[PDB]
Amino acid sequence: EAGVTAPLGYFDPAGFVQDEESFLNLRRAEIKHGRVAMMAALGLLVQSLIKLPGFDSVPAGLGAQWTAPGDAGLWTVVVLCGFFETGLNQWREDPKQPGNFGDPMNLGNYTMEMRNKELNNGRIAMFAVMGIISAEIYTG
Amino acid sequence: EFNGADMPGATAPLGWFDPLGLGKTEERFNKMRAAELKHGRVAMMASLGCVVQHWAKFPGFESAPAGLGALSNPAALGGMGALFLGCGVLELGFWSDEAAKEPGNFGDPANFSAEYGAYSKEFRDKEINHGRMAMMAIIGQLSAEAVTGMDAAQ
Amino acid sequence: LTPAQESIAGTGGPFPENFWDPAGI
Amino acid sequence: EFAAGMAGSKLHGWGEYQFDPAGFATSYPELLGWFRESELKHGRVAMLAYVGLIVPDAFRLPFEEVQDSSLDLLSAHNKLIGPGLGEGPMWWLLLACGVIESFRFKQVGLAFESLTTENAGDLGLRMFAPSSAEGMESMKMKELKNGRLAMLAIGGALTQGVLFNAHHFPFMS
Ligand code: CLA
Numbered sequence: 036e037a038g039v040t041a042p043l044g045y046f047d048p049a050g051f052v053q054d055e056e057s058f059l060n061l062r063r064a065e066i067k068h069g070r071v072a073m074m075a076a077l078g079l080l081v082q083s084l085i086k087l088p089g090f091d092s093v094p095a096g097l098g099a100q101w102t103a104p105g106d107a108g109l110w111t112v113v114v115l116c117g118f119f120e121t122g123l124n125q126w127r128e129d130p131k132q133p134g135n136f137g138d139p140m141n142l143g144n145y146t147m148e149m150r151n152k153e154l155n156n157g158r159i160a161m162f163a164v165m166g167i168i169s170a171e172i173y174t175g
Numbered sequence: 176e177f178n179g180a181d182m183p184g185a186t187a188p189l190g191w192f193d194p195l196g197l198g199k200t201e202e203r204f205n206k207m208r209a210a211e212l213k214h215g216r217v218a219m220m221a222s223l224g225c226v227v228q229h230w231a232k233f234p235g236f237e238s239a240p241a242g243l244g245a246l247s248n249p250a251a252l253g254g255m256g257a258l259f260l261g262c263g264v265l266e267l268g269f270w271s272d273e274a275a276k277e278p279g280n281f282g283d284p285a286n287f288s289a290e291y292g293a294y295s296k297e298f299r300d301k302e303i304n305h306g307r308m309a310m311m312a313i314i315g316q317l318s319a320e321a322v323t324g325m326d327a328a329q
Numbered sequence: 330l331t332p333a334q335e336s337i338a339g340t341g342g343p344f345p346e347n348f349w350d351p352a353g354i
Numbered sequence: 355e356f357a358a359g360m361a362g363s364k365l366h367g368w369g370e371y372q373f374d375p376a377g378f379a380t381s382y383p384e385l386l387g388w389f390r391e392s393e394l395k396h397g398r399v400a401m402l403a404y405v406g407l408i409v410p411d412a413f414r415l416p417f418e419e420v421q422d423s424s425l426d427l428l429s430a431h432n433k434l435i436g437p438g439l440g441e442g443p444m445w446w447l448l449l450a451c452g453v454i455e456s457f458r459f460k461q462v463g464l465a466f467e468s469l470t471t472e473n474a475g476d477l478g479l480r481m482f483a484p485s486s487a488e489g490m491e492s493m494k495m496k497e498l499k500n501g502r503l504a505m506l507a508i509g510g511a512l513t514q515g516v517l518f519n520a521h522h523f524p525f526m527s
């Protein structure tokens with residue numbers, strides 16, 4: 036155990052891994068959170084630049100939550116994410132080997148180096164998105 | 176799935192057109208074909224829906240523009256909403272892809288294979304190609320409509 | 330179905346004999 | 355086995371619905387062909403009844419006697435009977451329907467002696483029809499289902515339209 040995607044720091048202290056199934060669940064959650072956070076970083080970046088059709092009025096920042104078009108957009112995004120996460124989507128993850136959705140787009144390899152890069156970039160994106168959101172809600 | 180030229184979607188113009196090679200193993204191809212058939216059918220019906228809705232409407236939906244902005248009318252929104260529930264009933268229920276025996280095979284509810292058709296490769300290819308053409312079209316009709324406000328007629 | 334899935338077969342879906350599981354959970 | 359092997363029990367939603375609570379089919383086997391002919395007649399009359407309940411609002415026949423805009427499902431028949439006997443467009447329709455019906459006597463004999471269970475309701479029209487026997491059976495089940503639905507729908511539409519004055523398509527107050 037503890038020999039999968041642990042660069043430059045080895046195993047994190049006070050790790051909650053426990054048994055193999057617990058570590059599998061934790062890795063699934065970690066990769067999911069990373070991927071979301073990476074997505075959120077990119078969404079904020081692109082929203083600061085361009086807006087959807089019929090979406091120019093709504094604020095580019097967090098304010099889209101309580102605006103009318105932004106509210107409907109967020110609700111439908113949540114519904115689609117539910118469709119994707121409940122398993123209804125054909126590309127669904129293997130119960131073992133979490134974070135592997137079968138590679139929908141044949142982008143390429145699945146090497147340990149690629150897994151480490153994905154996980155670490157998600158790790159950065161976590162802090163990036165959290166800091167951005169905190170800064171916005173705090174300053175204004 | 177070493178070869179797929181015998182699959183319904185080969186067609187003469189471009190046999191097994193797949194430069195990016197997204198689906199090359201039987202499982203990936205089955206999933207992609209289920210998605211393609213669903214998209215094609217949805218498009219075939221969206222396109223005809225536009226065409227008919229322009230010159231026809233149900234009682235109580237008279238005010239609806241019948242075009243891209245049809246969702247604006249509250250009655251049309253309630254109708255889209257009931258259609259969404261019915262489509263969910265079909266999807267999670269009768270026409271669920273997981274329960275499907277083959278990609279896009281939902282059991283032939285009405286025996287078109289028995290009458291005025293057959294479950295032949297020719298008809299599968301016909302369905303696939305019509306779905307592609309309807310797909311490309313709805314995008315065109317809807318987009319052209321947005322750029323230049325017009326109805327389906329074009 | 331599967332040997333594990335049979336532990337509850339006959340108690341689901343519109344008719345009892347079905348096994349409704351579109352997500353394949 | 356059931357009825358006389360007639361179409362109308364197979365190809366249901368779940369495959370083999372055999373609807374006969376009151377055992378008319380078993381009690382009167384000699385009348386099964388008559389029952390099938392009557393069911394098909396009622397269904398094919400109800401289909402056209404619904405379509406002719408809808409269409410008149412959009413269109414009216416060319417002759418200058420049905421052009422009144424107040425000829426709803428309620429007043430149409432009584433108004434169109436007209437004066438005396440054998441003078442109205444309703445009478446023209448009755449005579450046309452009788453002429454059509456008389457051919458069934460040619461087909462199945464004068465007294466429906468030849469009316470069997472495998473030819474009940476079959477008037478020999480085979481245009482735009484399935485080539486295969488299975489396809490023909492499937493289309494017969496479609497026809498039976500559509501006819502039963504149209505019978506129930508025309509009954510409900512007429513009852514509702516008269517009860518609440520909604521003589522047009524919604525048929526709801
Ligand atoms: C606590 C909820 C719950 C749980 C644990 C289960 C569990 C089960 N159901 Mg399911 N079921 C539920 C609720 C639930 N059901 C409800 C409410 C319905 C009515 C639609 C059904 C209808 C149903 C049928 C018809 C059948 C089953 C069957 C099964 C079994 C196999 C399928 C499966 O993997 O289900 C696992 C289910 C889940 C993990 C639930 C996932 C829910 C997702 C995340 C969506 C939730 C969103 C929801 C709409 C709430 C939104 C609220 C928000 C807007 C505020 C399994 C024991 C099958 C069976 O017993 O076969 C013998 C079967 O045939 N169920």
Ligand code: KC2
Nearest residue numbers: 362363364365366367368369370371372373495499500503
């Ligand atoms: C005692 C049990 C019982 C009751 C009390 C009952 C009541 C009602 C009511 C009123 C409340 C209505 C309005 C109604 C309507 C329909 N019933 Mg139903 N029904 C019962 C039993 C069966 C069986 C066994 C079958 C069946 C069917 C159909 C079909 C579709 C036919 C088709 O399309 O083939 C329709 C429209 C057949 C089927 O296939 O349904 C998908 C079928 O096999 N029913 N049924």
Ligand SMILES: CC1=C(C#C/C(C)=C/C=C/C(C)=C/C=C/C=C(C)/C=C/C=C(C)/C=C/[C@@]23O[C@]2(C)C[C@@H](O)CC3(C)C)C(C)(C)C[C@H](O)C1
Nearest residue numbers: 373427428429430431432433505506508509510512513516
């Ligand atoms: C619950 C159940 C079932 C059931 C059922 C039940 C209870 C069914 C009931 C059906 C019922 C009760 C059906 C009435 C029809 C009435 C009609 C056609 C009336 C026509 C009336 C006409 C054509 C009148 C015409 C005119 O008067 C007009 C309009 C104006 C006048 O100037 C002129 C004339 C006189 C010409 C299933 C589905 C069978 C099986 C399932 O398993 C269980």
Ligand SMILES: CCCCCCCCCCCCO[C@H]1O[C@H](CO)[C@@H](O[C@H]2O[C@H](CO)[C@@H](O)[C@H](O)[C@H]2O)[C@H](O)[C@H]1O
Nearest residue numbers: 063113117120121122127128129130131133352353354
């Ligand atoms: C904003 C946050 C909203 C949160 C909404 C919460 C919705 C209600 C909770 C849903 C939890 C569902 O959990 C349940 O279905 C998941 C669907 O992937 C399963 O998911 C897991 O197991 C299944 C095994 O085949 C498959 O779905 C996947 O391979 C695996 O990831 C979980 O094993 C199960 O416990």
